[PDB]
Structures are given as structure tokens and as C-alpha cells.
Amino acid sequence: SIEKIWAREILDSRGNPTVEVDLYTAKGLFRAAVPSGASTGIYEALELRDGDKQRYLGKGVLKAVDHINSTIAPALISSGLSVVEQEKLDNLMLELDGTENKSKFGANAILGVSLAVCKAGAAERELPLYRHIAQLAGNSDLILPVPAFNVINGGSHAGNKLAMQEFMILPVGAESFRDAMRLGAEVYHTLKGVIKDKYGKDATNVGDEGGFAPNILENSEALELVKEAIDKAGYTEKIVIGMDVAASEFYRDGKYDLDFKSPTDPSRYITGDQLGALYQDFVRDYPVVSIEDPFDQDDWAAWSKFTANVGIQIVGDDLTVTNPKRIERAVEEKACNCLLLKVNQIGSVTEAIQACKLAQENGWGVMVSHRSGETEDTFIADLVVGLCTGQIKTGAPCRSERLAKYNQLMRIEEELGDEARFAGHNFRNPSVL
Amino acid sequence: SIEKIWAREILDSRGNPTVEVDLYTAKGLFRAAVPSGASTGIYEALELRDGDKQRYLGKGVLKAVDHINSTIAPALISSGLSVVEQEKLDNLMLELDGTENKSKFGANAILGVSLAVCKAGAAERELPLYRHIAQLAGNSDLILPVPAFNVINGGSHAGNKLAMQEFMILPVGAESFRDAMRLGAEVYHTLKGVIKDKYGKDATNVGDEGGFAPNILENSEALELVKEAIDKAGYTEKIVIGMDVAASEFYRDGKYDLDFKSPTDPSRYITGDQLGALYQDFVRDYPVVSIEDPFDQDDWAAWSKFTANVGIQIVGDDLTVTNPKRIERAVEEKACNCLLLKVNQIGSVTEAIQACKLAQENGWGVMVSHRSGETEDTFIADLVVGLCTGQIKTGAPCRSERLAKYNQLMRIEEELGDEARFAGHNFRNPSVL
Ligand SMILES: C[C@]1(P(=O)(O)O)C[C@H](O)N(O)C1=O
Ligand SMILES: C[C@]1(P(=O)(O)O)C[C@H](O)N(O)C1=O
Ligand SMILES: [Mg+2]
Ligand SMILES: [Mg+2]
Ligand SMILES: [Mg+2]
Ligand SMILES: [Mg+2]
């Protein structure tokens, strides 16, 4: 079935090397590329980098690329398996690597091939990608997700003092996915004007995922700006707010530092209980319906307590790392109620689908996500539709490594035509539709 | 030959609507999308917007989309013309529109179809797109271009006081195109560090094309920053500097305002002779080998005079707007010696190729270019190779609406094998290769 596999080094959206794979069958060429995180969990599958400091400051992926071209490719070509057999092909790669964290080939080597196999398998079945994915997962009623656009940014890879990472808007009230795009774009452009007038003409350049990074410290101030943009755009009834705290980035000596990008002073640090109290203030005062990584990735007690005391969506990202073993624990301890699905945290399509289904079988929500380093690849657009999760976050409506996904979801909606169902207010549980 | 043509509204890289066209033949689906400028010349073909202030702040393109779906599509289908007939199909669309500047359907409507036809035509010919373009243009050779990366920005769409629009790096001394990408990315990442250290960690958010906008006024200081980054990265002998002044943006009453983003003060203004004297200093003191739009789009006297007094490349952008009639005037008056090629400045593939051939026959260089509003489309990567121009500017190595083109050029280089040649130091006159 597989005739040829050829990998290369391309540049991702931040200008860093990443893996791209060309897989050939009788039906042609199938291409996929691998994304790369900025604030990665310590439990993520291994991203293999060259570490040659003379080349791309040690960020090359020539080794991953060679593993694919020289070792993985002949193995899969010899397998006598059809590209539709995703699970058997992924399992072959997992055994050939043979390590728990994919540290021999790199998660980025294995994922690249996994994604290309999946696209080739869709064509072999004569199906669009999202339909092939639905069938791999045992689904049949497709769903267009609510997009979650980050519009204000802070955290460890933003230049301001704002400690929490992402402030997102979700047009739960839009009529369709195409309508949701209009709502998101209009509020984003509105917000640009708001920030410009208040903070200055130089305050509206964008961060890695297209969000604004005004120089503020107060997290409540970010929320106030977002709420202001929504209202001024005219969509108070139709748009709500999500947050990615990424609290692992500012966990310090059992406590949390909301001014961690200023010179270190431990008198600043607060306990998780204080932090929890802050979140409760946010949920009271703003339409915050979802909070991601509110506590450190190892701070299991704090997660379980906070989740037990709120009625909103609580999302595991660095806590769960799209990893069935960590997810089973989180389910048992009721640490959260939503999984952030990132295929390159676990490193294969089959495992990501397994992680999604384990979440869903235990009544969790699932939100498909980009990484900070993205590409022109639009795989996750089909993935979120085929897995029917009802929610995706894949950037501000700015920069085309983000828009390529949102544009593709508009095409899918169009293609499904009258069978298109938008998750809307059922983004947490879209199966009821 | 054309079975179906369907147009839709997608979002470009700034989050504004633009035109995308799907064209179906017997060989499948061929998709293209239209870019949009931020500092457009007054003589560019018309970009048709809806102007509905309630929807996308006036920037919808539903009217242009309807012109394609209702009018252009059935006409071209009923013509029975083969997609290999680029000129005949383009000419038919010009006839239907019937206006000089494509103001009936919009240059964006017409170009959308023109691009998709070209891709479909390549498939019909069973050629890669760059080879089909080469045949259309009457070329037999192919060359990989030197990339020009916009790394420091000022001008009318940057929040600093810096007047001149773009400061670019060109790895003329690279060994290959793929090597040129490494050189550019490394200098780009080095520059980010230089800016962070000199202007603060909050000064490194990116503009529309992925470059930095530090808060500076003097244009010489921008050149200082770029030189310092080149030297720090260790590539002094291999990377040179290009400028896009975009002087039409700060032309005022026959003079030029190098502080036009400060409250208006006519005592500030300088003459074209003084501005030319300033450029002379830059060319003496920095490795500037190319200056684009050094004077206003109508200031023919200043262009001719400057061009006669320097040995560097002088690029017409807003001066020439990819338009054979204005190019003929510039040729006659020796206003410049290079054409910036922007397919949507003129509105069709056929007219753009005509523009290119006219420049080359009169000994001009041609630099293929992006617009500020780009998409995930990679047509101009194939275009610059098929036209053999030896130079492209399509952004900083940041944001995938820019990387998509750079990545595609790496793929083409790889595809051409040992037949691939890199323009290098012959970027102005690649025909000697
Ligand atoms: C910064 C990011 P990653 O790059 O994935 O670490 C972006 C994503 O939105 N997310 O959840 C994050 O934590
Ligand atoms: C600002 C831009 P456009 O959007 O084309 O006006 C970008 C391009 O680099 N260029 O030459 C310009 O003048
Ligand atoms: Mg992270
Ligand atoms: Mg996260
Ligand atoms: Mg311009
Ligand atoms: Mg220009």
C-alpha cells in the first residue's frame, strides 16, 4: 500500500525547523507537518531536536527526518498493511521505537508519519479526512466546533508582565461556524482599536498565536478589555470567555507567582488557595466558562478541590498531556472535566483518538488545540470535526497558520451542507445534537 | 473543459475577508486565493469591497464572490475553452468586465479565477505549476530566487515613528535556497535578541509581515540594528540589505515628511534632492543593494535623477503597479531598473506575465512580491521560479502565510534536484545563468 515516504525540514510559524512528511500511495501524494509547543508539559512525549548550536541555534530536526527516511519508511513499506489500518501502522511505529516517551525516533518523527498515513487512508477509503477520522473513532454524526480565539496574551513567551497565558473568546451564540468566524474577527478588530486608544499606537503588534500583548500586569484587566471589546462589537449575548492560565509556568516553591516576569521576590508568591479564590472572582465578574491549567501539572490536590467547587469547564493541558495513563488518573481523582487534545503531546493519531474517547466515555469535554509553533497544515480542523468534540482553539483570527484551520472548517461546513450542525451552547456535550 | 467554478469568502492573514476560488476539471479540484495590500498605489487595479459597515467593518467581499459565481463562472464554462488557454480565458474575463481598472467585477474577482485556471492548466499539461508558468512565459530555464526578508518595519502601518516601511535582509551569499532560509531565520532570531536587549523584552511583538517594530525614529538606526544582527549571527559577508521606503505614504505637497506619524508640521518636510542625499549616505555606510519606492508614485523627476546617480537596484512598486503601460513610461524615462511583481496590482496572470516579460526585455530585474494581507496560498513561489526572476520578497521568516511560500520554494528546489540553481549574487540579472 505505502509506496514511498519522504520527510524534510520545513520552518514553522515562529521560524523554527519542524518535520514535514510526504507519503505516497497509488492514489498520490499525502503531506502532513508537525507542530511544536512553546510551554510544553514535562510529561509530553519527546520532541527530538538536533542540538547542533551552529545550526538554527540547536533547533534542527535533521535526526527526526533521517529516522523517518532511513528507518521508519522501509519498515512501513514492508509491513504489508493498507494505509486504512491506522491503528496497526501506529502500533508498528510504537514498537519499532520501543520507548515509553518515543525518545528513540522522537514524537515528532512518529507523528509526522502517523498524520500522513491518516490522510492517505482517507483517500484510500474515498472519504474526506474528517469522515475517515470519524470512522476510526466510531462516530457518524459530525459536528462543527465552537472556535476559541485567543485575543489577549501573556505568560512565559509574551513580552509583557501579564502572567496568565491566554484570554479567549468563544462565540457560543453564533448561527453557524462561518458566522462564528465573523463574530470572532469583528471583536478582534474592535479590540485592536480599544487597545490602540488606551495603551498607544505601538501596543497592537501580535504574539506567536496572533493575540495582542498589551503591557499590563493585572489579569482582571485583560478580562476587562476582552469584555469591553465584546460589548462594543455588539455581541454580549453571543460570546463568552475562556482562559489558559498555564500555571505550571509560574509555579514556585509550592506557590504561584503572578509577577514572575519581574525580578524575583518571594514575598509576591501566593498559595493555590489564593489563586483559586482569584479564579472564583473571575467566574463571578466575567462570562468565563472555561479555565485551562489553573494549577501546576503535578498539583493534583488543588485541581480536584477547585473542580469540585465550580460549575464551569476545567481543562487539562499540561496536566493530562493527551496521555491515556494521566487521563485515567485525572478521571479517577476528578481533577478536571475537559481534555485538551494535542496530537504531538502523545505522538500518534491512534493514541490521541484513544485519549479523546477515554475522556468522552467518562463524560468529559474535549477541546482540540494548536501549538504555539504551527504550520500551514490543517489536519486538526478535520480532526475536531471527525471526533465531534464541539470545541477547538487554534489561534486569534490573525496569522495564516491559524486562519488555515479556521478557513478549512468553513469549507467543511460548506461541504456538509444541510447536515452541518454547529455545537453552539452544547460545546461541552455536542452528542445531544 | 471547466466543469465548475465556485467562489467563497475566506479570511486573510490580518483577519480580513478575501476571495477564494475552487475550479473543477476532469483532473480534480484546483484552489487559489487572492492577497490584499496595505499601502496600495493609486494606480492599482480595483480591489472590490462590499462597504457594508456593519459586516466585517466594511471589508466583506461577497460582491466580488457573487460576480464570480453568477457571471464569470457560467461564461467561462459555456465558452468551452481549455484551462491550458490562460490568455484566452483571461482575455474573456477582461472583455466581460469591460473596464480599464477592472472596476466592474473587481480585480480580486478576476484574479481569483485567473490563478485557479493556471493551476488547472498545469494539471492538464501534466506539469508542475512552475513548469506550466515557464511555458506560458516562454522560458526554458528555472532558477531559485534570493529571498528578501522584511525584519524591521516602519511606515504607515507600524506603531513606531519610523517613516520608511521595510528593512530587508537578502542572503545573496547562501549556497542554495534551503541554505538561504537558514541564514534568514538565524539572523531573524538574532535580531529578536538584539532588540530585546536594547529596547526591552516587550519590544519584540511582530507586525503584519512578521517583522519587528522597535520604537525608533531615525532610519539609519534601523539600518544599524539590521547590520548588528547580521554581524552577530556571523554572516557579514553573505547577507545584504534591501529597503522598501514606500515614499508615496509620506509625500506631502511636493515634499517628503520623514516624521509623518507625529503631529503635522510642514517645517519638517524635505525635498526629493535631500531624500536622495540621505539614500546616498545609506548606500555609502551600509550594505544596501536595493531600494524600492524611493520617491512618490508620480515623482518621475526624482526617480530618473536618483537612478542615474547610483549603481544599486531601484525597484518600482507603487510607481509601476505591475502595469505594462506604466512600465513603458518608466522604461522610457529610465525611472528604475527593477519591477516588483504583484499579480493583484494588475489583476490577471496573463497581464502579470506580460509585465514581467516587458521588464526583462528592457534589462530590468523583477522581484516577485507578497502583499501585506496574504493567505495560505503558495502560487507566487511557483510563479517566481517559472518566471526565472531570481528574487522574491514574501515576508520575515515568521507567520505561515509567509513561511508557506518559503517552504514551497524549498520543496521546488528539492524537486528540481541537481538541475536546481540559486540566483545568488546574480539576483538582479539571473539570465546570465
Ligand atoms: C502556549 C500553548 P503550547 O505551545 O501548546 O505550550 C499554545 C496552546 O494554546 N496552549 O494550550 C499552550 O499552552
Ligand atoms: C505593505 C506592502 P503592500 O501590502 O503590498 O502595500 C507589503 C509589500 O512588501 N510591499 O511592497 C508593500 O508596499
Ligand atoms: Mg503550553
Ligand atoms: Mg495550554
Ligand atoms: Mg504598499
Ligand atoms: Mg512596496
XYZ file of N, CA and C and ligand atoms in Angstrom, chain A residues 39 44 165-166 168 243-247 292-293 315-318 340 342 345 369-371 393, ligand 4:
70
model
N 5.093 26.323 25.618
C 5.075 26.000 27.046
C 4.658 24.546 27.205
N 5.128 15.548 28.341
C 4.883 15.374 26.910
C 5.863 14.371 26.307
N -1.676 33.056 30.553
C -1.171 32.899 29.199
C -2.124 33.383 28.099
N -3.384 32.982 28.175
C -4.314 33.259 27.076
C -5.679 33.648 27.580
N -9.352 34.043 25.833
C -10.010 33.641 24.603
C -11.483 34.015 24.572
N -10.018 30.842 29.359
C -8.688 31.205 29.810
C -7.762 29.997 29.758
N -6.516 30.228 29.358
C -5.457 29.258 29.567
C -4.492 29.908 30.537
N -4.499 29.430 31.770
C -3.656 30.040 32.786
C -2.212 29.598 32.604
N -2.032 28.315 32.269
C -0.707 27.686 32.141
C 0.108 27.880 33.419
N -0.502 27.525 34.549
C 0.035 27.858 35.862
C 1.356 27.157 36.162
N -8.244 26.695 31.710
C -7.306 25.631 31.386
C -6.055 25.767 32.235
N -5.510 24.632 32.665
C -4.319 24.586 33.525
C -4.304 25.634 34.657
N -10.061 22.569 32.118
C -9.322 21.872 31.065
C -7.894 21.430 31.439
N -7.628 20.140 31.276
C -6.288 19.630 31.448
C -5.493 19.770 30.162
N -4.326 20.398 30.257
C -3.409 20.511 29.127
C -2.076 19.899 29.517
N -1.266 20.653 30.250
C -0.024 20.097 30.774
C -0.292 19.038 31.860
N -7.657 18.780 26.824
C -7.114 19.490 25.675
C -6.409 18.455 24.813
N -3.972 17.455 22.059
C -2.842 17.810 21.211
C -2.131 16.542 20.722
N 1.532 15.929 21.793
C 1.838 15.648 23.194
C 2.004 14.143 23.443
N -6.619 21.349 20.018
C -5.774 22.536 20.141
C -4.588 22.556 19.202
N -4.221 23.763 18.770
C -2.942 24.037 18.126
C -1.792 23.977 19.136
N -0.560 24.151 18.646
C 0.570 24.526 19.494
C 1.005 25.935 19.097
N -9.454 25.307 19.793
C -8.728 26.573 19.849
C -7.487 26.465 18.977
Mg -2.369 25.322 27.332
